[PDB]
Design a protein around this nucleic acid. Structure first.
Ligand SMILES: [Mn+2]
Ligand SMILES: [Mn+2]
Ligand SMILES: [Mn+2]
Length: 430
DNA sequence: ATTATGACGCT
DNA sequence: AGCGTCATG
């Protein structure tokens, strides 16, 4: 009744760059613009592995994780850009620097949570209160929302996509209570006005397009962002959740796409998010644990409390490389040379980080994989990180892993190593 | 041989 | 602390 919390207290946006690494390469090389194109790392094995795909190329069925040679079978005119190689490994610096460009623009509008290289959440609650007070009670014009979709609309009693978008928006704005500074639908609408502004600033000042979702929490914002890509934004209201979730596969919700979501489906015998509403909180907690159970109980009703953390910088800085199959490292000389390559990239990135961001990492995590181990990581050990020196870091990592060589021969390495990873963690202000 | 990361939960 | 899970540019 009057005391149930509906989870409509916040306005939260998720901004996600469209096919980000492709756009970075297309800005640099105008010959790639408005073409089917993709970004690859390496080249010798099956033409390299695709990690990003332009929307033109997605129309041919090109996806991430495809080998470029197979993608060329689907799309013979596919254009390819390769990630830079430094010290024998992929080097993602260009895309990290482009990410910082975008994140710095977003930070002008509100504090953001960097969620990945290409995406950030925005807590717009306060910016919305301010813009509302500025607007007094002036209605919101459709012209302020030129790329916005309202999920669920139009409905009730033209065959073009843009025409449908405008119809849905008109129904939404016609139903608005613009006289109530506390109406959640109004607050989301003003949030969407602000996100149109943020996205226009990003495009004007970087050349990069993005999509976005606007809702009352992070999971709904992320889901909304996905609904109308590319170069569009979507408002998911509290009221739109029952219909949206009634046919939503559970795996589409962030954190339910792996084993936990499979167990929800199998144990409860359901397929769609909305079906979760029929279980009690205690029932869900009995199957999935206290935390997951309470989260699922609120989430299937559109309610989630995870805050937008004030964090625009990555918490860890890491360097990793796989050595698959016949290229696994089988001598100490090899292991030490590759630890040095990784350590040198880490030193470069860490020194830049210290100059830009006034912090220093204090812990070094060393991770390896051995041949014949299914797990991603086979051993993960930490050591102190007291100096930004690649030779010291590689010697320290070798010291923490050298007891892994089950070879009686001290020159050989067995079983051979199929992955090396160096990660700097536990930052302190300096 | 589906690679390079990066956040977070569990014990 | 070390491991597992979820996410994917
Ligand atoms: Mn993206
Ligand atoms: Mn993303
Ligand atoms: Mn993606």
């Amino acid at each position: 009744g009057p005391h149930m919390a509906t989870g409509q207290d916040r306005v939260v946006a998720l901004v996600d760059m469209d096919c980000f690494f492709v756009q970075v390469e297309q800005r640099q090389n105008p010959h790639l613009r408005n073409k089917p194109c993709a970004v690859v790392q390496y080249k010798s094995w099956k033409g390299g592995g695709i990690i990003a795909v332009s929307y033109e190329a997605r129309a041919f069925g090109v996806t991430r994780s495809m080998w470029a040679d197979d993608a060329k079978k689907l799309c013979p005119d596919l254009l390819l850009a390769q990630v830079r190689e430094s010290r024998g490994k992929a080097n993602l610096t260009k895309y990290r620097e482009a990410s910082v460009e975008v994140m710095e623009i977003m930070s002008r509008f509100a504090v953001i949570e960097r969620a990945s290289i290409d995406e950030a959440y925005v807590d717009l609650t306060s910016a919305v209160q301010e813009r509302l007070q500025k607007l007094q009670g002036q209605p919101i014009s459709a012209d302020l929302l030129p790329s916005t979709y309202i999920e669920g609309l139009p409905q009730g009693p033209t065959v073009q996509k843009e025409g449908m978008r405008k119809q849905g928006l008109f129904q939404w704005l016609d139903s608005l209570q613009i006289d109530n500074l506390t109406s959640p639908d109004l607050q989301l609408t003003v949030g969407a006005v602000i996100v149109e502004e943020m996205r226009a600033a990003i495009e004007r000042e970087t050349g990069f397009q993005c999509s976005a979702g606007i809702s009352h929490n992070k999971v709904l914002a992320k889901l909304a962002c996905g609904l109308n890509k590319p170069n569009r934004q979507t408002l998911v209201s509290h009221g739109s959740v029952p219909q949206l979730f009634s046919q939503m596969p559970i795996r589409k919700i962030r954190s339910l796409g792996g084993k936990l979501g499979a167990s929800v489906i199998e144990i409860l015998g359901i397929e769609y998010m909305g079906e979760l509403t029929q279980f009690t909180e205690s029932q869900l907690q009995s199957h999935f644990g206290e935390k997951n159970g309470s989260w699922l109980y609120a989430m299937c009703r559109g309610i989630e409390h995870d805050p937008v953390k004030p964090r625009q910088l990555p918490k860890t800085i890491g360097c990793s490389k796989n050595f698959p199959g016949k290229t696994a490292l089988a001598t100490r000389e090899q292991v030490q040379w590759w630890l040095l390559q990784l350590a040198q990239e880490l030193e470069e990135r860490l020194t830049k980080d210290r100059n830009d961001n006034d912090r220093v990492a204090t812990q070094l995590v060393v991770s390896i994989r051995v041949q014949g181990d299914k797990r991603l990581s086979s051993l993960r050990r930490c050591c102190a990180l007291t100096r930004y020196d690649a030779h010291k870091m590689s010697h320290d990592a070798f010291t923490v892993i050298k007891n892994c060589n089950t070879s009686g021969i001290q020159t050989e390495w067995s079983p051979p190593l199929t992955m090396l990873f160096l990660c700097a963690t536990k930052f302190s202000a300096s």
